[PDB]
Amino acid sequence: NPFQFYLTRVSGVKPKYNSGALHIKDILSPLFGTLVSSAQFNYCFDVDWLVKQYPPEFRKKPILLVHGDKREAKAHLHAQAKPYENISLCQAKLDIAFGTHHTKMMLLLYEEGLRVVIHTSNLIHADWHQKTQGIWLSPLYPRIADGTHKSGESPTHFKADLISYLMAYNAPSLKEWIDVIHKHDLSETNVYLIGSTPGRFQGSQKDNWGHFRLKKLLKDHASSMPNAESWPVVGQFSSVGSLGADESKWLCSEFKESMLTLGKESSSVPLYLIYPSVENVRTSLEGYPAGGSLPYSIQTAEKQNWLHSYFHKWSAETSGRSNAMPHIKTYMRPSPDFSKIAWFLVTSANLSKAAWGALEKNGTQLMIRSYELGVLFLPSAFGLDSFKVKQKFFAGSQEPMATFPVPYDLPPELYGSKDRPWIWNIPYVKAPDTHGNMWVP
Numbered sequence: 001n002p003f004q005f006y007l008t009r010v011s012g013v014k015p016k017y018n019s020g021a022l023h024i025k026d027i028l029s030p031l032f033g034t035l036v037s038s039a040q041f042n043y044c045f046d047v048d049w050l051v052k053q054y055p056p057e058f059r060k061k062p063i064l065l066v067h068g069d070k071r072e073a074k075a076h077l078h079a080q081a082k083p084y085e086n087i088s089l090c091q092a093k094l095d096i097a098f099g100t101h102h103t104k105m106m107l108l109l110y111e112e113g114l115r116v117v118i119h120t121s122n123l124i125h126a127d128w129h130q131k132t133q134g135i136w137l138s139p140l141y142p143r144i145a146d147g148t149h150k151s152g153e154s155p156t157h158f159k160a161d162l163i164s165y166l167m168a169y170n171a172p173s174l175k176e177w178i179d180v181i182h183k184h185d186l187s188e189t190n191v192y193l194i195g196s197t198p199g200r201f202q203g204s205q206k207d208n209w210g211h212f213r214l215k216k217l218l219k220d221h222a223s224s225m226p227n228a229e230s231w232p233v234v235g236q237f238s239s240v241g242s243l244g245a246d247e248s249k250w251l252c253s254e255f256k257e258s259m260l261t262l263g264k265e266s267s268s269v270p271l272y273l274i275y276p277s278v279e280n281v282r283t284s285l286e287g288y289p290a291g292g293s294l295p296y297s298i299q300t301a302e303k304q305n306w307l308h309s310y311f312h313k314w315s316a317e318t319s320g321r322s323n324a325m326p327h328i329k330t331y332m333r334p335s336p337d338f339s340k341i342a343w344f345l346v347t348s349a350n351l352s353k354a355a356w357g358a359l360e361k362n363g364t365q366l367m368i369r370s371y372e373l374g375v376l377f378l379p380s381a382f383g384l385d386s387f388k389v390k391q392k393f394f395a396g397s398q399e400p401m402a403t404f405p406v407p408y409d410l411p412p413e414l415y416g417s418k419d420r421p422w423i424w425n426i427p428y429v430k431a432p433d434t435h436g437n438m439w440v441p
């Protein structure tokens with residue numbers, strides 16, 4: 001298949017729902033390449049666990065951990081890595097308040113080439129155990145021959161764009177990886193990179209990052225169809241930021257306006273937001289503890305009750321994952337009957353201004369607080385006008401090259417009147433979870 005979009009393995013589903021899924025041990029296996037060194041970009045790390053996920057023969061190859069921790073949290077991570085002499089750390093600068101290093105990416109340097117993995121899981125056991133998580137696997141990129149001068153660039157500009165993303169860190173350990181990427185041929189890449197990095201972007205940089213980056217790609221590389229106003233927008237996420245007192249402050253002004261862009265010409269577009277209900281969490285494989293990774297606070301939620309009328313339940317019968325709570329984040333543009341999509345994005349970015357950017361300075365500046373990363377699937381990059389939705393995520397469609405594996409059910413189902421969004425810091429003591437327990441923060 002051309003998309004190379006995978007879900008993580010889920011412990012407890014029937015084998016048919018894990019055949020074609022990937023565990024971290026599979027990604028790092030020698031079958032994927034003979035590891036020379038690796039970089040692990042992430043938010044949360046269990047270093048003892050992480051090293052055990054590498055094949056025994058590769059466990060002493062250099063590993064770089066790229067994180068955003070400061071002060072005591074940084075000291076704790078260094079203490080975790082101190083027993084492993086082969087592990088180096090890079091502290092990503094976070095010079096804007098309330099920003100985080102959320103990007104989840106593996107750079108895997110092999111004797112045979114280079115692989116890039118952009119995904120949604122933290123490097124801890126629970127994120128790969130019973131959650132719905134997403135993975136994009138790059139091709140094996142060959143090394144450009146010494147003395148040969150070629151760009152190694154793809155029609156999606158992925159090589160330059162990935163280098164640009166890494167350059168924003170201004171970090172010596174990542175300049176080393178930039179030099180590795182320069183030496184490899186990434187021309188087969190058929191996805192577009194969408195990153196966020198912290199800063200305040202104007203002018204020639206406004207379109208580099210966040211939702212303006214998405215808007216620019218959709219303007220340049222998608223086409224607007226008749227009745228485009230009837231094609232919904234779907235956003236699916238595991239956390240929600242403070243979006244403002246009403247939908248006009250950010251969600252339906254600048255964020256939705258970027259997401260509904262198609263083509264270069266100049267709204268009643270339906271907006272579906274998918275986020276687990278309390279009942280989704282209670283009846284999940286993990287039970288209420290799944291809500292530890294759905295960090296929507298009551299303090300934030302009570303300021304924006306208008307938002308919850310957009311919320312739809314998590315349902316994933318198509319991938320056998322209705323009870324595997326989502327930590328994947330995805331955004332896409334389905335047709336009015338949900339049979340086709342105009343594009344699909346898998347990313348680390350939750351539904352927040354910190355992740356996607358917020359306009360400042362009278363609309364002239366995009367301010368982003370965090371590091372985020374995702375990849376965008378556009379039909380034009382595959383020689384197509386749209387993607388047909390795969391009916392069963394792991395099934396065998398009539399042509400894999402035209403048929404995109406959407407990991408949850410369409411159409412999304414609106415919350416019922418008794419449903420509530422999962423809010424992690426209030427108690428749930430009316431009905432026990434799948435392990436027999438209540439939730440008492």
Ligand SMILES: O=C(O)c1c[nH]c2c(-c3ccccc3NCCS(=O)(=O)F)cccc2c1=O
Pocket residue numbers: 043044045073101102120122292293294295
């Ligand atoms: O990147 C990701 O996917 C994630 C990012 N944040 C969280 C949080 C969280 C949110 C606000 C402030 C601190 C948090 N947690 C401290 C962890 S740490 O300092 O040890 F790294 C809580 C539950 C899950 C996630 C998560 O899954």
